[PDB]
Design a protein around this ligand. Structure first.
Ligand code: A1BRH
Ligand code: ZN
Length: 140
């Protein structure tokens, strides 16, 4: 579980979005596993606006924060899961590290701020959904 709170926006994995998130939908993309809903209260996270490939992510199945190197956002084939069939996932970055299904929502961050959230995993790799291209997240 896990979310990003920026301005009047809440960023979650689309597969973990609640009834409330759907009733207050701003934007969603199934191919990216991302959903953004509106909030009453203002959030304090800052989104990074950079091309960084080094950072740290949170892993709840180990209660630990891990430093990792990751690939740039890309269109990647992903095996079937409990939430999606086997398909190409877009705007996805990969790193070598531990992850389990319940780790989804854990934040990946760099020196500039939030880079993205845990979305895929398996065979000793962890996949993160990028949010650095969504410029509108800190606008309006
Ligand atoms: C971190 N992690 N997440 C999942 C998962 O089920 N994500 C849902 C999802 C998103 N896109 C396609 N399927 C997983 C499974 C096995 C091991 C690690 C894992
Ligand atoms: Zn950065």
């Amino acid at each position: 579980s896990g979310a990003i709170y920026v301005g009047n926006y809440r960023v979650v994995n689309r597969h973990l979005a609640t009834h409330n998130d759907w009733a207050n939908l701003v934007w969603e993309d199934s191919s990216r596993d991302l959903l953004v809903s509106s909030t009453t209260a203002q959030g304090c996270d800052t989104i990074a606006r950079c091309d960084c490939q080094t950072g740290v992510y949170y892993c709840s199945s180990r209660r630990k924060h891990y430093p990792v190197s990751f690939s740039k956002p890309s269109l990647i084939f992903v095996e079937a899961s409990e939430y999606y069939p086997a398909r190409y996932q877009s705007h996805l970055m990969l790193a070598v590290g531990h992850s389990e299904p319940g780790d989804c929502g854990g934040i990946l961050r760099c020196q500039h701020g939030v880079v993205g959230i845990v979305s895929t995993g398996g065979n000793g790799l962890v996949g993160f959904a990028d949010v650095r291209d969504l410029l509108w997240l800190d606008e309006e």
